[PDB]
């Protein structure tokens, strides 16, 4: 058993919709982690208990360099909690905001590592459904760490389908904005939105009203900056094909179509997953408590079964 007070609560990394992630230290080993702290009341109140359960099951059965690995999960008389590897580098949305845009090559690095994680997830019959900049953290070495498995769905092999209207509005695939069911190709759409943002420096579709936003996703053709390379334009045009069947990654071969697209011609997919490739950026941290790649907005704050039968967990590593 692992206890709330096995952990120092050092710095508030993130807080909101989800819950509260805090940079902690393990009192025993002195190791550093990010601990997502959820209130059981909030979860039950909202029916979305199966998501907070599925998140645990997925973090327990997935192992990949570009997925956040779970160290321990447990609960208390009031709260569900996950302890996960800490990504010192912040998230890409933070870096992108500052940089405004990445180079194609830099976008290709993060893209390849995402294509890597998603191929792996799809191989395990998991659909992630929430690919967005905000969920893409960087670790201490500048490698992608996918984060927030709330909306995942298991059991999704090949042409199996899903029905939950979920995801993040700006990132929704068109098919998800129609009635009935959709498949795993929503993740490739999602990949296209983050890649477009990386290379073009904005979302391909945006309105602050969701009805207009949804209209844009369903009805508007993407635009590309003139200077974007033909290979980049092609990649984006494939991933953000509105028809999932015409979409790059939408065929029966899933990730293989994306991996074999010419944008990725220079990638050795074995070297990616084996992190042999030199990152384009490594976050410069002085200490373990150096939270410069998180908003001072959030960090400068102070801080204080039947249903969850399959939630608790401890790692072999």
């Amino acid at each position: 058993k692992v206890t709330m007070n096995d952990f120092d609560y050092l710095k508030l990394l993130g807080k909101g919709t989800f819950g509260k992630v805090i940079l902690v230290r393990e009192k025993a080993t002195g190791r550093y982690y990010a601990m997502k702290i959820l209130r059981k009341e909030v979860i039950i109140a909202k029916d979305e208990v199966a998501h907070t359960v599925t998140e645990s099951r997925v973090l327990q059965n997935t192992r990949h360099p570009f997925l956040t690995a779970l160290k321990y999960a447990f609960q208390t008389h009031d709260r569900l909690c996950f302890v996960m590897e800490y990504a010192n580098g912040g998230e890409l949305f933070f870096h992108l905001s500052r940089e405004r845009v990445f180079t194609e090559e830099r976008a290709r690095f993060y893209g390849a590592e995402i294509v890597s994680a998603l191929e792996y997830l799809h191989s395990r019959d998991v659909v992630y459904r929430d690919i967005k900049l905000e969920n893409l953290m960087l670790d201490k070495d500048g490698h992608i760490k996918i984060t927030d498995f709330g909306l995942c769905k298991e059991g999704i092999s090949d042409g199996a389908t899903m029905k939950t209207f979920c995801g993040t509005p700006e990132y929704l695939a068109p098919e998800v904005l129609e009635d009935n069911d959709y498949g795993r190709a929503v993740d490739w759409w999602g990949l296209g939105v983050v890649m477009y943002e990386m290379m073009c420096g904005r979302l391909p579709f945006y309105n602050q009203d969701h009805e207009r936003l949804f209209e844009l996703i369903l009805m508007e053709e993407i635009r590309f900056p003139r200077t974007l390379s033909p290979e980049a334009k092609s990649l984006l045009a494939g991933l953000l094909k509105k028809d999932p069947k015409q979409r790059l990654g939408g065929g029966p071969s899933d990730a293989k179509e994306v991996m074999e697209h010419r944008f990725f011609l220079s990638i050795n997919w074995q070297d990616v997953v084996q992190k042999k490739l030199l990152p384009p950026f490594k976050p410069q941290v002085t200490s373990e408590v150096d939270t410069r790649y998180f908003d001072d907005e959030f960090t400068a704050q102070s801080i204080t079964q039947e249903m969850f039968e399959d939630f608790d967990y401890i790692a072999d590593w």
Binding site: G16, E134, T168, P169, E170
Partner: peptide
């Protein structure tokens, strides 16, 4: 800026 986003589930 480009505002932040928040996932949902109907």
């Amino acid at each position: 800026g480009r505002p932040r986003t928040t996932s949902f589930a109907e």
